[model samples]
Target chain A: SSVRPYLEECTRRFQEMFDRHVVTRPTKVELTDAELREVIDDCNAAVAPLGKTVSDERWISYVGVVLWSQSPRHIKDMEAFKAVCVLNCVTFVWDDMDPALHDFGLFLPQLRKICEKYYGPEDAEVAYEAARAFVTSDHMFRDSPIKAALCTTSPEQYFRFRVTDIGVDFWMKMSYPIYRHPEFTEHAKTSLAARMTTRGLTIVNDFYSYDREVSLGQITNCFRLCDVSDETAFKEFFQARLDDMIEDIECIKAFDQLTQDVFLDLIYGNFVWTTSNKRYKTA
Target chain B: IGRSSVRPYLEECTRRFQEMFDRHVVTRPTKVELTDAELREVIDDCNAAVAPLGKTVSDERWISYVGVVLWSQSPRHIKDMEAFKAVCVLNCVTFVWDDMDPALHDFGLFLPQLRKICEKYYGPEDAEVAYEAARAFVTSDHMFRDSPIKAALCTTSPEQYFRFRVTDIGVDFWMKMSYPIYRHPEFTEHAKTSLAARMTTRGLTIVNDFYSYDREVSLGQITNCFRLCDVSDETAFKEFFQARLDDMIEDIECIKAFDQLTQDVFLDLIYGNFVWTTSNKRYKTAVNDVNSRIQA
Candidate 1:
């Protein structure tokens, strides 16, 4: 390869990125094998129940990879990490629930209880916002013609909704000692690098979730939000977005050297996690 | 919590309520319509009432140009039509405080004084809801008046736009003024914070911005999302309103908690506004509906 331009050009962009960047630049997780084992044990111990719908199976397998391996980070507080893991398990379930059985208000006390237990009432407020975004996006997709119009017709307009539903702001605050600082959080709120960095996370989520959502007749996937025609087109778009995203984070400055390095680590680690994990891959 | 199982009663209430309302209030032909001349005169009357502020409706910003029937969908009153029109005209006039960007002295002092002025029209049955609506309207309006982000030049993201634009457009206040909505303080509280209610508010605001698009553009008010993506183009704004309306309705059906009462309130809120909107649009005609009311 004689000094390639964007990630990997001319072929299936996904396969190339998977090989060129994802596999090669894979970031190391600080969690020890012992540490990883307990996280699995504790979270699996804490995760939600199984049921008949395909949703349940995905829930069973997917929530595990949602953050733990997907976006690798040092878990300074194991309890706090586990609580968020279980919280996602709860939210992902409700987000997929049917309209008849959908009772979001029923679960808030539990959500609030877990949050208050781990962090405080303030954190619980943050949790509710993210949860509302999830459900609201679900409904908007079903009923919002403008939602789909922007998704399919306009690329620049679509990211805001994705930023919301993907819970970028919430996750931005949640990630670590680096991001949690008030100044960093405020700057990150409008940072070009920060938003593009989320674009990285979002594109990867869409790329992987695309196949499964299509499998289940789900229309709300972010893959549908793009202008692409097929999974192949989506793959091309996703890779290019990631390529541009990488370029921006490389260029724009949101945080210091240490924090910036952590984000690249996150992007690289996320791809590897998406590929390496048994959760998304299994039947 | 005191809200009871009135769901079954709601239908019976609707039948009895509208008939009773019709007998007392007559159905629709109240403000049959206002010609541009009549409309202008009504504005003059409201402006004359507020000349203390040294600006007529013409002198101020915002829809100092729009009608109170734009918000107040009060029905045809049989008795004291004089009082009814006065209250209607006064309510129409009071919309100035919202968009005039009133100073604290003017907003706090004379704005609230409209409550006592209008208190004569609504009875004890109507008093609390009117008071609460007025109270929340002024309270939130005051928050908006003194707070930052009033400048049009400040950059806002999509979420930022919705966060500010929803209530800032004064939809909640005007919505409270809608027929019978001012009667329910509890529903107003629920509508104040709930995502679905806010979504509806956003929907109504879109319509408001669209209706006043020409005046706003004339005055250099680019705050409305109608100006979104340089949306003055014909096709785009049409799509903008169409799609935005669909978004609001969908969010309602999916997000609505749907305990019967909520469903009913949403219907009244959305469709009732629709009827009034069409009626007011029709007001531009040569005359009112020849057979406007069956309550005769």
Candidate 2:
């Protein structure tokens, strides 16, 4: 009986949060490091109340599959899709980290083990293929709702990463016929899961990636270890990180100077960002 | 052989010439009598109507000359028909003047004026001489080139007339003054200067001088003039004049009766409301003032 209400609340809260998180509105403000952590914690907490008893691994896996199936409807670019994959991977990691998490323990090692069993040493190729295939199947704009809600970066920024790395160089390296018909395989999935681990590790390592060069000590020592208070200060700190991400990717250079409004919408979901499902329905 | 051969052709030519003569000169018989000034009054009035609006009637400066001549000599005068015919002749003369002088200022007036001079001095039957006089007037300095008086006469007759009345008489005379005063250099310039100053004082950054009469007068000038001359807070005076001028030019078919058609056209054309907008309706009152002054 408690399970039903707990599930209902979890779904309702996630839906509300998802709405707030995904849609881009004019009034939305960017989250700082603390705020981001708060967001992650809030989402976790919403599910946390269910505890190990109700937090069934089978139920979580089912939800993950549902999200993956709907991924095409939400994610547009490889980066964004990769970012979603990374997010799920992270969630899986978090779930496994707790003895009480009640799922397959800590996702990274499990993902590694799964990749090694299938692809052996050529896991990178497989991982890249899986990431690409997952992302490409969806025809959403780069800044799609799934990406906006689940992924950290904008769709346009993600596309730039693909075009710069995979688009030009991948085609150049391809042997004519084989490149033309790149075979899809389970090995690709293993490779993707493994590569995704690396991406996840990078995100976790430099959660405060913004201060890497400028305030390296502060980033590594204080923010990295999650030692901060004052939600506003934390938000400001993360916003600086998001800004750094945007600047690091040269795609933003094509845009007329990035405005605070756009940056805010990208980092913290706005009404427009949140309403992607509705937009898809109507459009 | 040459004489015999020429005789047959000569005889045929003479027969054809006689037939032509009877049809044109003899069968359509006319007792020619020259018109005096009194008989010419209606023609003058007609020309007066047309002239100010830049129209013409014959070699006569006014429709009165043609009207009087047609009345006096046609034996059976069809006033409207004769007037029409007189206007027709004036149109012909206008075409001739237009062709003779491409840059003719008021050849419409010049043609009729020339026709009148010819009818008086050369004889009503001497159309060739009248045509010659018209040709001379167009090409010569007296009509076209350096003659300021002649140029002034063609263009500013109504304006000058308006000023003469406006300056000398009481305010009643100002109301009676026709469309031409709007073109008068003195009036237009004074009004423009005043309107510009007023607009500047009101903190309007951009005020356009859309009205142009006598090629120089502008809407701003007209507006300024009315406001300045308003005297008793009657800001509507300029607008009244402008509207009346427009109506007279656009709607009044009896322009020949009004005395100065070119001046009328100039004033009306110059004073038309250009700045038309909902919030800015009050500003276009210059046109209304012209009409009001005319009615007053």
Candidate 3:
């Protein structure tokens, strides 16, 4: 489903993106918030968890749009729409609270109710599983010595934490089901393509959210993990992942059509939504 | 200590254990080797500590360390007994290191010996897994060594306890000990990092904490789960036990979704360690009912 030249183009463009401290990717598909806004609005109305007082409550809508945007033909599926809507609110709420409160622990039990409420009991199991992976990974490292130790951590050492911490698994898991595809096989989950896209998502979040995260005094961002001179090297690390993800999509043995279709759509949609959203400060 | 059905595996385990014990305890070729007298001195020095006592080759505890490896995974599932025996050797030195320095003051001397035992048996690629785990063990050992924050974990977040408790229990290295013992359904980097993997590793250590709680309390150790949990109230203690057990069952179902062969090996580690610990005199109760409650 991917054009071979797009990989090279993305590789070239990302270098420029890094050079200018701009975070956007090259995509053949241009998405309109106008087209996506209806689905986002419907879900936010039905999923009432988003709070008015929250600093980043609007960020919840970005996740809502991105979740629906990956659906095949952008189908009208209310149940799946509400599920992703609540999940977005979960992330924003989980992130906004102080780690010392241990408030997120309450969510693990409540998350199942959210999943079962919308995803249905049969499919809710993996939904909760995916959400728990993110919540635990997100909460566990905060306020620890993990922050002070970050400067000394290698890309290899730090990479292990960020993969799950970035919550890409939840996005990928939810995306397939929205497309009416089967769950990704364990082989598919660990494929080179999946690994590449995982890192790509990490930088996507880190690169875009650097200003807001720094203002809040957060050290968990990958940008904060490196010295100023090393930012180029980190961007190179991200470019390597982005290029390889495209490489696998262009020619690969491991992917099913559903994986290739979902990921490529996800790549284009994720980039457009991430850059345009008012959730983060933009260049 | 295991059942009649498992007696053949136990005999195989016992017989092979002597061969491994002979390598480290007799030949003493390992960099981490200690004379019985040297081990005695360390334990005597740890009169203040509880985990190290009676681990000398002269004590039953030294002989009993085999059950942890024996029952960690079934001797039946072990495809390569020689490789299994290599795990047995490294395990003894690990226990020796445990007795020598809980804070890892002796990590410099112990790691090379683990590498020696592993490299002799494992292929170069497989040996690196242990090398990585050894590095993890030592890194965590030093990280949690600052006790200005250590004892306070009893009141802090579960994550605060978990950050250091991971290496303290040696789960990272223990899971991979039988690394080459399977074929079709193997351990992968993906599998090792799974939520199920985290549950079983933490669950096994909780089992260790339960069985050893009385001994630690008597020894004035502050790190036991009893000290961490609200054990003074019988109701909360039961609820705590029920909650952890329920969580463990959920984790088991996830593991069960994998191939039968892979799940079988993991099952052996979970149940076998329990059986091994319950029967072993080292974990025998001087006094405590939580061990029995956890058994329930």
Residue B61 of model 3, lDDT score: 48
**Candidate 2, after superposition: displacement of residue B148 in Å?**
74
When summed lDDT is taken over every stretch of 10 residues in candidate 2 chain B, the lowest stretch is B198-207
Candidate 2 C-alpha error for residue B100, in Å? 83
Instruction: Name the weakest run of 10 consecutive residues (lDDT summed) in model 1 chain B.
Output: B287-296
TM-score of 3: 0.43
Q: List lDDT for all candidates, in order.
A: 0.45, 0.28, 0.50
Q: Which is the winner by lDDT between candidate 1 and candidate 3?
A: 3
* Model 1 clashing residue pairs (backbone): none
**TM-scores across all candidates?**
0.45, 0.18, 0.43
Which scores greater on DockQ, model 1 or model 2? 1
Across residues B1-296, which tens digit of lDDT does each residue of candidate 3 receive?
11102222233433433343243223211122334664444333222222223222333444455457655664445576555656655554455444333543444555565676678767876676655555455544444443433454433434334333544666646655555655333343323343323435544655666667666565545555545566555676666655655444544554454445666655566655666776676576543321221110
Q: Tell me, by lDDT, which candidate is best.
A: 3
Each prediction's RMSD over C-alphas, in Å, is 14.7, 38.4, 22.3
User: In candidate 3, residue A206 scores what lDDT?
Assistant: 64
Q: Considering lDDT, where higher is better, how would the candidates rank from best to worst?
A: 3, 1, 2
Instruction: Give the fraction of reference interface contacts each candidate recovers.
Output: 0.00, 0.00, 0.00
